[PDB]
Design a protein around this nucleic acid. Structure first.
Ligand SMILES: [Mg+2]
Ligand SMILES: [Mg+2]
Lengths: 80, 60, 81, 183, 129, 149
RNA sequence: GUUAUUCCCAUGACCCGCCGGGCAGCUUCCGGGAAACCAAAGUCUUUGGGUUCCGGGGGGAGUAUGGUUGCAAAGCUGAAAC
RNA sequence: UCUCGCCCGAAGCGUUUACUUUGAAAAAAUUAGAGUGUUCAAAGCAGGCCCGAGCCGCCUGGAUACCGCAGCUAGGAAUAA
């Protein structure tokens, strides 16, 4: 015997993105809070463009297969 | 093979059964099509002339 | 099986399995009739009664029986709350 | 447009006019309007009030309702006040209705799209997460529907109200559920 | 690719019954597939089931009873005119009073013998026993 | 798997069940559209325009935040490229592989891949003629590819 | 949990994972198979997922003859008597 | 729509089928089948009863059925277009 309706939330993180029952994706929005002048930047984690802020005007994310990584002293959270 | 309320069954199924009564293969009771299926070859060998002659005597 | 005359002709009822609900045949000699005992109340003494489990062959081969016994004891409610 | 609004709605329609009187809803309810309402018992003797909303004007009932559900409860009994809109349920064209020289039909006016959007409307302060049509061993259908965990206690007591309201609107046997929200 | 999705479903239950499992999944839905299981629920060969609402096209989780030996689909869906079902009675179902056949009649999805009570008939969905 | 290469990977994206954005992204549909006119004035793909909002400006899928889709938004006030982008990109490399064959008329691995890319054009011509957004007189031989980079 | 730039700072290098698709393997009475064997050669008399090419006792034989292509060598299509 | 003589006819007079069920429509003959002791049977459409002539005689039978596909009409609106 086996369960489908009530699996474990341990089990379903492990399973693939679109292979679970609700299929909600695995990326997140991250709150890059650069010390540039004032601005909190919402930026996609699995990004593809060089996310250049408009105040400080430098790099905040690297385009990388998978997910971006941050440059120097940039802190973040999730908006939920 | 046919439905229950089939009037083609009701005229053909009855009249076949009445034919079996007018020969006397069956009883005058059971009027169902499955009781036709319960028949055999020895009823017909009884209802031939010589065996009813053998049942009405003088046959020897 | 009963007819329209309600007649008992049918020979025996073969032991249908517990997990599979599958019929155990006559010559299926890998069947099993498991029997786990009742215990009492607070005393923890043997009740003179028990509960009977019957499992079929293909469950028994594939290792499936061990999930089936303890979950049926759970379906009894005799191994966990 | 051939309306004369009745007594309990007149108690309702005066209450909104009483809310734009030098409170936080003055220029707001000067640009917010009326459709209809009803007065519905759920649970026996405890009656839940609901009102109806013009559909382009829903966002005025949507962005501003949390203080507004407090206010209208002050004027009405402290009983349950839930908000839904005016949905024109258009039937499909059957072959013998006519070809009435009508348009296509939209899918904001059709049945499957209508009454799933009222489950949206009832549970406003909490986003629904997942419905489960559990098929009971007959011709009956449960709606076991997941709900958010963020505003959970806000929509804790409302679930006693909701199943009674959604059967009179729609005719469906629901059961709102509180599990976790799972990212 | 993905075509005739009733044939998709009735291999999932068949492979889970002959494996002997407890509950299965069928990753698309249809009002075809809801009403076909509604035929099987009303007769009781399979237990409860429960449709997980995906906003695109849901999934079905069936609590198995364990009765089924074969749940199939007639693949091109031959049309059925009446007095031709006894042909399909001899052909498909194993005995004379076991099994059912699922028909697509003028007033919905029906049962084998419920179809000639309606005396309408229609196209096939499949067979089960 | 796929059409012209037997790969059966599964790399897709899925929208979650959750609807329009809950707390942040204070950004109206009129404000989304005014940014999105600005992007396609600067000359970017609708497949690129969706990327631009998605990383940089915090925006989710535009279907929720506007009620509409970015090409229907685009066509409202006339910014069309007038040759669709499925047909644009496949032509944009079909010119190059013909050009690469013009200095290597022995690279027959590249010759076979031209057949696959010419396959994909004339299938996609058949679809766009069926929705009537691409008119029935339209053709594709050699030089239609060239000036339409 | 180590180790290399210089040490946060990134990636390297292994170590224990979970995901996807990939070439393969081990075992198993899922069953299938005439058997060898097969996770597909399974879900088949409890036979109907969609779809293309094909075999019908061995010989004569891809032979004779036609068309058709090839500069040619030969290719494709293909009998019959017995 | 009550242009015609509160309900009815009729009148504006319909995006189609496919499919399904009824309804028509068919030539018999042959076949399934009814009925009939042609002496039974294959047949055939025959006969059955009263009146000692006597009544310018009675009664019933010579059925029913499937008639592919296609065309037609009226019901059914599931699946597939
Ligand atoms: Mg292909
Ligand atoms: Mg092929």
């Amino acid at each position: 015997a086996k369960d489908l309706l009530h699996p474990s939330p341990e089990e379903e993180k492990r399973k693939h993105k679109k292979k679970r029952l609700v299929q909600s994706p695995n990326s997140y929005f991250m709150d890059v809070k650069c010390p540039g002048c004032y601005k909190i930047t919402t930026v996609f984690s699995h990004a593809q463009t060089v996310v250049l802020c408009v105040g400080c005007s430098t790099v905040l994310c690297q385009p990388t297969g998978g997910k971006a990584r941050l440059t120097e002293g940039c802190s973040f959270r999730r908006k939920q | 093979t046919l439905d229950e309320k089939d009037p083609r069954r009701l005229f053909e199924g009855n009249a076949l059964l009445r034919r079996l009564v007018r020969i006397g293969v069956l009883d005058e009771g059971k009027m169902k099509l499955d009781y036709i299926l319960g028949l055999k070859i020895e009823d017909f060998l009884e209802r031939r002339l010589q065996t009813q002659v053998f049942k009405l005597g003088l046959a020897k | 099986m009963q007819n329209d005359a309600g007649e008992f002709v049918d020979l025996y009822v073969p032991r249908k399995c517990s997990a599979s609900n599958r019929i155990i045949g006559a010559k299926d000699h890998a069947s099993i009739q498991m029997n786990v005992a009742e215990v009492d109340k607070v005393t923890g003494r043997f009740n003179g009664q028990f509960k009977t489990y019957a499992i079929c062959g293909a469950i028994r081969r594939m290792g499936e029986s061990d999930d089936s016994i303890l979950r049926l004891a759970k379906a009894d409610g005799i191994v966990s709350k | 447009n051939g309306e004369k609004p009745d007594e309990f709605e007149s108690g309702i329609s005066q209450a909104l006019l009483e809310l734009e009187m030098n409170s936080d809803l003055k220029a707001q309810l000067r640009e917010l309007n009326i459709t209809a309402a009803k007065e519905i018992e759920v649970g026996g003797g405890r009656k839940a009030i609901i009102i109806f909303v013009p559909v382009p004007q829903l966002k005025s009932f949507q962005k501003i309702q949390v203080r507004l559900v407090r206010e209208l409860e002050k004027k009405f009994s402290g009983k349950h006040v839930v908000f839904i809109a005016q949905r024109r349920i258009l039937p499909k064209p059957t072959r013998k209705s006519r070809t009435k020289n009508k348009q296509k039909r939209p899918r904001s006016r059709t049945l499957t799209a209508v009454h799933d959007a009222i489950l949206e409307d009832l549970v406003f302060p909490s986003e629904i997460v997942g419905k489960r049509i559990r098929v009971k061993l007959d011709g009956s259908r449960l709606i076991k529907v997941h709900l958010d965990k963020a505003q959970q206690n806000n929509v804790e007591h409302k679930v006693e109200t909701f199943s009674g309201v959604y059967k009179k609107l729609t005719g469906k046997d629901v059961n709102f559920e509180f599990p976790e929200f799972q990212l | 690719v993905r075509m005739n999705v009733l044939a998709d479903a009735l291999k999932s239950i068949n492979n889970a019954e002959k494996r002997g499992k407890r509950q299965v999944l069928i990753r698309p839905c249809s009002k075809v597939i809801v009403r076909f299981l509604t035929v099987m629920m009303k007769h009781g060969y399979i237990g409860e089931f429960e449709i997980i609402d995906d906003h695109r096209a849901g999934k079905i989780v069936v609590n198995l009873t364990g009765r089924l030996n074969k749940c199939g689909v007639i693949s091109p869906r031959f049309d059925v005119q009446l007095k031709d079902l006894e042909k399909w009675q001899n052909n498909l179902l194993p005995s004379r009073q076991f099994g059912f056949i699922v028909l697509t009649t003028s007033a919905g999805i029906m049962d084998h013998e419920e179809a000639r009570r309606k005396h309408t008939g229609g196209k096939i969905l499949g067979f089960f026993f | 798997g796929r059409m012209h290469a037997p790969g059966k990977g599964l790399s897709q994206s899925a929208l979650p069940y959750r609807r329009s954005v809950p707390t942040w992204l204070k950004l109206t549909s009129d404000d989304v559209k005014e940014q999105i006119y600005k992007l396609a004035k600067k000359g970017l793909t609708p497949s690129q325009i969706g990327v631009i909002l998605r990383d940089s400006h915090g925006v989710a899928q535009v279907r929720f935040v506007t009620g509409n889709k970015i090409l229907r938004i685009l066509k409202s006030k006339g910014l069309a490229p007038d040759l669709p982008e499925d047909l644009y990109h496949l032509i944009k490399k079909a010119v190059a592989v013909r050009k690469h064959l013009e200095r290597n008329r022995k690279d027959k691995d590249a010759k076979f891949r031209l057949i696959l890319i010419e396959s994909r054009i004339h299938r996609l011509a058949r679809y766009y003629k069926t929705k009537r957004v691409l008119p029935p007189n339209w053709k594709y031989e050699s030089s239609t590819a060239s000036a339409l980079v």
